[PDB]
Amino acid sequence: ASMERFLSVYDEVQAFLLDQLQSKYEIDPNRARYLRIMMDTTCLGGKYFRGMTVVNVAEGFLAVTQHDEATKERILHDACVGGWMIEFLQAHYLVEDDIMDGSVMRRGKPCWYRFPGVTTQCAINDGIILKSWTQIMAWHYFADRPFLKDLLCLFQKVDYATAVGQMYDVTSMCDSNKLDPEVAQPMTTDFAEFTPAIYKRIVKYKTTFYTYLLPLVMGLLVSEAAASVEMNLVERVAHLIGEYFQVQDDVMDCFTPPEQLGKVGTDIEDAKCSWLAVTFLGKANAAQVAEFKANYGEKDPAKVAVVKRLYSKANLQADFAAYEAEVVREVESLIEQLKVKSPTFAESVAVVWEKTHK
């Protein structure tokens, strides 16, 4: 099974990284232990959706391509390593984003920086190490691979797009004309930049490149199958599914109970440009817009409750159902176009969509 193989490779990669720190970086057993615990706490515990997508794409191609058994094993091992590079990249951005946002919990556990023996001083560096490990994995495991250059190039572009996305996200509540390193940034008062186009740009860069595009294209690279697809369709479908994924996360932040969510959602307090805020502003009357402005982006729980009740009374479920019908329609159309060059790849995309939609 794919999951058994995926988790066995984590143990192998972890052992390799820590053994390398001992043999080449003069590490002591106590600092190796700290880094082992850091890796487990930051990398494990999720669903491994991003990493398993690489494995699933590679598995799809194996089913229709002629290979020696040793080659099938090599491809599957490469897909697991590539999938772990993505999981570690996600771990890097979660560690850093939790510090930047002052987050309290992550997956029902405290954020890494909040651990007593960690602190922000160490956590920022731990986050840096997590991303350096993705490169150590690539150069070691893919040293002789024909796809090494393309993989490192794609990984770099995705990482950069994601850092650009975090900038778009953290500054989404400021007026663009006021951005100035010399002047403390006031929250917007007009919310003129809370538009579907601006929200789409935030989401496209902050999450879709690393959550959907990177796993799909990495699965193609380790399979030596990039010629079986039209890359423009891959980008379009990845960006489309990724946006839907984030709209789901925005709604859950506001209404999914903290116990089920695994944290206390603070998007309203943080004045985030969420799908709920953009959509609400897209249908509210003058009175509702005014009430929203007087209560958004403030920590006062009475003000947060006003925003939540404004959203509830605005019937955003109808807009969500309408957005979802449009996404089902467009995703199915792009899947159909993917079948022209690769029915196998289209099938992996269908599975990626099914898992997102539910």
Ligand X SMILES: Oc1ccc2[nH]cc(CN3CCN(c4nc5cc(Cl)ccc5s4)CC3)c2c1
Residues that bind ligand X (CB under 6 A): 251, 255, 308-309, 311-312, 316-317, 320
Would you state the torsion angle of the CA atoms of residues 8, 11, 14, 18, taken in this order, to the nearest 10 degrees? Answer: -140
* Residue 39 CB, nearest approach to its own copies (Å): 11
Nearer to its own copies, 19 or 332 (CB): 19
Binding-site residues from annotation: 97, 101, 169, 235, 249, 253, 267
Total length of the chain: 358
DSSP annotation string for 290-329: HHHHHHTT---HHHHHHHHHHHHHTTHHHHHHHHHHHHHH
Distances (CA, A) of 239 to 77, 164, 220, 249, 338: 27, 15, 17, 15, 15
Contact between 151 and 143 under an 8 Å Cβ cutoff? The reply is no
Binds 255: which of its own copies, ligand X, Zn ion, none (CB < 5-8 Å by kind): ligand X
Write the binding mask 202 to 241 for its own copies: x where contact by CB under 8 A, - elsewhere. Answer: --xx------------------------------------
Q: What is the footprint of its own copies within residues 6-65 (CB under 8 A)? A: 21, 25-28, 30-31, 33-35, 37-38, 41
As given in the structure block, the two tokens for residue 1 are 């099974």
Binds 129: which of Zn ion, its own copies, ligand X, none (CB < 5-8 Å by kind): its own copies
Answer yes or no whether residue 115 interacts with its own copies by CB under 8 A.
yes
102 three-class SS = coil
- 321-343 exposure pattern, b = at least 16 Cβ within 10 A, e = fewer: eebeeebeeebeebbeebeeebe
Nearer to Zn ion, 97 or 249 (CB): 97
Nearer to ligand X, 33 or 309 (CB): 309
Residue 28 and residue 31: Cα distance in Å, rounded? Answer: 6
* Residue 323 CB, nearest approach to ligand X (Å): 9
Instruction: Sort 24 into a burial class: Cβ within 10 Å, 0-12 / 13-18 / 19+.
Output: exposed
Answer yes or no whether residue 192 interacts with its own copies by CB under 8 A.
no
As given in the structure block, the two tokens for residue 277 are 């805020």
* Residue 162 CB, nearest approach to its own copies (Å): 9
Stretch in the footprint of its own copies (CB under 8 A) among 80-88, 146-154, 230-238, 316-324: 146-154
Contact between 112 and 118 under an 8 Å Cβ cutoff? The reply is yes
Interacting residues with its own copies (CB under 8 A): 21, 25-28, 30-31, 33-35, 37-38, 41, 96, 99-102, 115-122, 124-125, 128-129, 132, 135-136, 139, 149, 152-153, 156, 159-161, 163-164, 166-168, 170-171, 176-177, 179-185, 201, 204-205
